[PDB]
Structure formats: structure tokens, C-alpha cells
Amino acid sequence: EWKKKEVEELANLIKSYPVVALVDVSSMPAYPLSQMRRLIRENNGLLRVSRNTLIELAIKKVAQELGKPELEKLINYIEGGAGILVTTMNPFKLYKFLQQNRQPAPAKPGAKVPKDVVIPAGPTSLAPGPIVGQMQAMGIPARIERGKVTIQKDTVVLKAGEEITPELANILNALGIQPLEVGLDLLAVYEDGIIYTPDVLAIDESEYINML
Amino acid sequence: MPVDAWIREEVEIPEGVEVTVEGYKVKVKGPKGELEREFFWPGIQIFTEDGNVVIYKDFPRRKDVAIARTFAAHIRNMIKGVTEGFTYKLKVVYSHFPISVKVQGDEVIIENFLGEKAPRKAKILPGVTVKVRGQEIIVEGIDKEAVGQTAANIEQATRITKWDRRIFQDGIYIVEKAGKPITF
Amino acid sequence: RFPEAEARIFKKYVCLRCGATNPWGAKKCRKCGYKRLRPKAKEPR
Amino acid sequence: MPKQVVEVLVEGGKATPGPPLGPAIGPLGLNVKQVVDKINEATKDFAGMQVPVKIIVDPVTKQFEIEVGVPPTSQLIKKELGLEKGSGEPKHNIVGNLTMEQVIKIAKMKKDQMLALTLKAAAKEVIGTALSMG
RNA sequence: UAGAAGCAGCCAUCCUUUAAAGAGUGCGUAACAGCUCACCCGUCGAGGUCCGGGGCCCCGAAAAUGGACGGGGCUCAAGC
RNA sequence: GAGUCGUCUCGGGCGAGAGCCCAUAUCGACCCCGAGGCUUGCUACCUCGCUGUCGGCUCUUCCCAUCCUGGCCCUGCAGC
């Protein structure tokens, strides 16, 4: 193609929305995300890419310091499959929306899991098979109930920062439950010369002012 | 196509592997044994330049650049050969008669191969150790090349070519190589 | 049984310019170029 | 399935197909064809065409979760054109054409099923389904 | 057509939306489902893949007293 | 016999076409290019102060484009 065709077109795009965010759109397939993608489009925003246009921030900074500048987004942020999400939704709405749609996660065995992996209690709704034998091996009680394989009691198999192994992952999969709990991470959110990050969006300033 | 003209490559070695040259012959000594090889190409100097082993010739040709990268890969396999062994697993699977695979001597013997009163055999080099655990068989040993030969010699002996290849299928096959060999 | 055996044995190509089982990524014996060659197994495949 | 127990087809102008429904059997509510009865009326259009839907057969607390085939776009355009076929012989006949007002009525209800974001965009989808039949 | 639901076959092959999508490349299913590619972004952080002339060298290349480059022998040449 | 190679013998390349479908499991036209000296014929070189014919018999050498035995690959190779 050619450089600074694209950055310019993006430069223009950025000015139009009040709130411009960078999110990692690499975690999620594809029916879940796509129904959300459509939903954003109706509610006044869009998602975009191209290969090197999440760098060249220098032109964007020159274009204004209220969009994506180098001001607080000092480091030129280009992550493996990141996208840029433009919207009217304020950072706090944007943040909350994002925390709720995130799931199901993919299966990618051999990752360190960012959140807890659990086994529940209840019927799998699958018939007698090697699946009872696997559960027993991990030391997870089971019985036949409903003519189906049933778990007699839950237990939390692994913690955050712990890997899912392929043996563990395969058990999560047979059950038809994701081994991973990752979805879309927001690297950072920009609005009107201020950068919002999850720690910023979390607290509120007025609560300190009000107590003190 | 590759923009070389020096041609000079550089091979990264840790401090946990030391390498010493003496002519056009490379010896790689690490924690677990040592392994010597001869890289035979004419007109090429292989020498150790500090922490890096460098393989170079002054006049580049397309043919020389292939040879240089192959030798560079051989040193890398040797490096990860002298730290830890390579493990290939083979499974023995059978069409009718239980089939008894045991290592007797420095050859693996397979008996009861389709009811046979005769051995099928495959050579087991001293750098490679072969352990049989039930009907899983594991070929293990220092060097990737040694391990690759030993394992493959076992499969080819039992190989069905004497009858139908979709109905007579008894024999020991390469379940792991480092993926699943091999399809079209 | 089945999918182990037919792979090491059968998961290869043949070249009807040589009448020998060659590698599958090869279009030749080691030399014979191309004519317009095709499998090996036909009717069941 | 492989004689069609989970997978089941229900007609959009007729009811109780013999081939899926007879083998699968069992009370899912009270029958396999309890769900069937519900489906055919709602999906129903001019054309009696085969509308894919699903049932999950578990006898054992009479458990099911079912989907609701909301009538397809293809089925809907049959009603407006007045032809229950696209062509009687693939791509040798009239696929028909719709006037502007009729395409929009279809898109309006279809909106929710479709990936769209305006109601113009939807109507372009429906018109395009019309053109390539056979 | 029971089914033809990308995948017995025939013809068309259109429209919206994007890490990404072809009325679908192959497997698979009785037909679906399911597995998967082209494709893309991004990491590896480079010069990348091509195609087209020419010179040479290889393949194509099977024969009957031991016959061949005059003979021996010769491969950084004693070759072109 | 030499020369010669139309004729003869044999090979290679291209792949129309049938093999239910699928050119190559198998069979393979049109056309084009070589090899051999084993059929036939052409040559008038060699002998008319003779180089006696064919077939069989007996006795022996050599060659492979190999009928069998050995070792191998495919298949529209279930086994046989």
C-alpha cells in the first residue's frame, strides 16, 4: 500500500469519536465476538486494524493531543492482534460493557490461565463412557445418575497464574467447558487528554473528596 | 532469494556447552557425554570465534549456503543432545496374534509376529537405549540422529509389503517422532 | 492398528514415471520431471 | 444421527414428517412431535419448505432444549413473489423480481436474525437472496 | 430429494459486517454436525518470493573374442 | 561379409479416448524423435587360376531389450 495514507485516514477517524480505546481482539472467536461487533456498529462506534497504523503515533500527536497521542501513550502499542475501538460510550460504560462480554473463551492448552478453573457438580448429560474414568483419576467423585454420567461434587482444580495442562484441558473440553477464561483485554482507553486504565476506571476520585 | 555474499553464519552456544575445533572437525562436550562429528565440505573453514561457532567461506555460492545452514543445525541438535536425551515412542499394534517385543542383546527381537517361529530384528546402537514397558516401547538416547535411526530401523523390519497393507497391519509403528509421521 | 500402519507404510506418493514409492512432497522420483502424474490408489482411495 | 434423531426437519406448510420424527420417537414434553406441532405454525409460509430446527432427545426427565427456526429469508421471498420455487429447472427460468415496498417488509422482521446495523443494509441482503435461485 | 443443509448432482455464485469468511480446498457424514484450509494480523524482524532468455552439466541411453580418448593415466587438471 | 537401414525389431516423448465415476489398477489412437543389425531389400566394394549351400547332429564361447530361480515397488492388491 503506502505509509501515512492509512495513518491519515485513521487520524481523521479518531477525531470524530470522543473515546478511542485499544483492546486485544486476538483472544476471542467469532460468533460471540461477531454478535457484539454488530451490536457496537448500531450503538455508534466501529472496530478497525491494519498491520502498522497502531504505530506512527507522531502524526496522531501532531494532529491533536486529545485522540491517540504520544502524551501518555508514550510507548507505541502494537500487540499481537490488537484492534482499535472507537466509540461514544464513556470510558466507565465502555469498561463495564467489556467486563460482561468476554466469554466463552477459546481452548488453547498449555497456557497459564488468568482466572480460576473449576469443575462443578451436576450431570454432564453424557452417557457412560471413558469420561467417568477420567474424573476418577483426578480424584473427583462420580456416579451414574439419569442413566448419564454425573459429578457428585465439585472442586476447584487450579488457581490463577497456574497452567492448564493438556490432560486437564482435555477433561474441561470433554465436559464442554473452556479451560481458559481469557477474553478481550483493554490495553488502554483514551478520552479527551486523559488516559483511562482499569485501575483509573475502578476508583472514583469524588469518593475520597467526600470522606475527607 | 537469500542475500548473502560474505557468506558467514553465526551459531549461538550457551556457557553450558563448550565447543573446541581442530581442523574441519567439531567436538561438542557438555554435561551428558560428548559427541564428535566430521563436517565434510571442501573449501569451508569452521572455527570457534569466542562464544560463537562460525561457519564461513569467502566465495558464496548457492550450494555452499545450504551446506552452512545444515552444519549449523547439526551443532544445535548436538547442543540439545549433550544437555538432555531425545525420546521417540513407538506402539506395537496387532491384527491377531499377541506379539512379544523384548530387547535381547544389542538387537531388539520381535517374536510371535503373525504366529512366526522366526525373529524380526532391528539394530540398537550403544548411544541409544531401548526400554520396553508393556506394549509401549520407547527409543531414547543422546543424539537426535542416533535416536532417529534406531527408532526407524524397528518400523521398517516389521513393515508389511508381503501382503495387503490395509488388512495385514500387525507390526510396531512410529507413534511419536515429534509429531505423527507421515501422511500425504 | 489401522491408522498407525497406514501412514508409515501407505502415506507417501508413487510416481508413474519410475514405479517406486517416493516422498510425498516430491513430484518426481529424484529426477524424472513431470508429464501429468496422479496417485497411486484408485477406485477405493 | 445417522438416521436423524437430534437433527430434524419441519415443514413450513405441513406437519409431522415421517423420516426424522418416527425413528427418534420418545416423550419430550409428551412426544418428539410435540415440539414439531409448535414449530410448523410459527415458521409457516406460502411455500411448504424444509426448515432445519433442533430437538435433543433425552427420555429420562423428558428433557430438551430446542431452537426456534424464525422463518428464513428464502422462504419469505416465496410468499411475496408468488412462486414456491426459484426456477422449475435450475437457472433456465424466472427467479422473479420484487417491487421496492415488499423487500423492506421482509427485512424489517428479518433484522434481528441478520447481521445488519441499518434497515437499508438488510433489504440489500433479501434482494440478493432472490436473484440466485434455481 | 427422506436428506443434497459448502461436500449425489445442476445452475446461480449474490448482500451486510470485519483479528477473519470462499453460497466454500480436502477429509467426514446415508445427507448434517465435526476437523481444516486458503485468508488475515502479529510475532520471528528480513530483502523477499517469482517468472524468462543464455552457456554448461545431469537424465533420456539396450548387444554379442578384451576395446578404447592413439595407449597408459588424468577430476584446484593432463578437462572445457 | 563390409556399406546401408526404406522394410523389420525395439525404445522414448505428447495423451485423444474407456475403465460406473476417475487418461495412467489396466488398456491406449493421431503425431513426433531415437536405438539395434535379428527379417526383407537396396549397394556392386571383396572372391569367378573355388571364401563349397541349407537343415539336423555333435562341441563350445559371448551378449541382454531376462522365461525361471534371488532381492524389490504398485494395484480397480480381502484370501487364494
Side-chain angles (χ1 to χ4, degrees), chain B residues 11-172:
Chain B
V11 185
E12 46 290 312
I13 323 301
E15 50 198 65
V17 184
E18 294 300 78
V19 173
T20 180
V21 286
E22 54 289 310
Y24 51 104
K25 296 185 51 61
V26 55
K27 179 183 287 294
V28 185
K29 52 193 162 291
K32 183 165 50 47
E34 34 178 57
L35 304 160
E36 184 197 278
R37 269 179 47 100
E38 176 157 321
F39 292 180
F40 187 84
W41 193 245
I44 200 160
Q45 282 78 275
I46 179 160
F47 283 114
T48 313
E49 309 181 314
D50 196 43
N52 290 334
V53 175
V54 161
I55 314 174
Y56 77 95
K57 174 166 191 56
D58 193 68
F59 305 120
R61 44 184 179 288
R62 186 153 63 184
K63 309 200 297 298
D64 194 95
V65 180
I67 292 298
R69 206 198 195 260
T70 299
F71 293 181
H74 281 204
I75 313 156
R76 293 184 189 113
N77 292 352
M78 289 189 284
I79 279 178
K80 292 176 189 165
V82 290
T83 46
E84 298 182 302
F86 281 96
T87 42
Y88 285 38
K89 207 169 70 53
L90 282 64
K91 188 177 192 281
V92 76
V93 283
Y94 69 88
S95 282
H96 197 93
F97 285 105
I99 169 188
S100 295
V101 171
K102 47 265 187 295
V103 165
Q104 292 173 197
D106 288 285
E107 298 295 297
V108 35
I109 185 173
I110 306 169
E111 293 294 282
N112 306 296
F113 183 55
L114 214 65
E116 283 173 38
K117 299 161 180 186
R120 301 317 207 214
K121 283 170 165 155
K123 304 196 165 79
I124 305 171
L125 308 168
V128 186
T129 196
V130 175
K131 300 182 295 291
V132 176
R133 293 154 311 126
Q135 290 278 272
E136 308 183 7
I137 296 89
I138 179 166
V139 172
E140 182 185 293
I142 182 167
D143 201 341
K144 194 187 199 62
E145 302 171 87
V147 166
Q149 297 278 12
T150 303
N153 298 344
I154 305 176
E155 171 277 314
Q156 294 170 116
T158 47
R159 189 180 178 258
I160 299 292
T161 190
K162 311 194 191 68
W163 310 269
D164 209 78
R165 286 130 207 157
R166 313 152 311 185
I167 299 293
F168 291 88
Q169 301 173 311
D170 179 0
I172 174 158

Side-chain angles (χ1 to χ4, degrees), chain A residues 37 47-48 50-51 78-79 82:
Chain A
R37 284 177 177 168
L47 178 93
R48 199 57 69 215
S50 282
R51 217 292 180 137
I78 192 170
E79 295 65 60

Side-chain angles (χ1 to χ4, degrees), chain D residues 20 79 119 123 125:
Chain D
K79 182 161 52 48
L119 301 177
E125 301 166 55

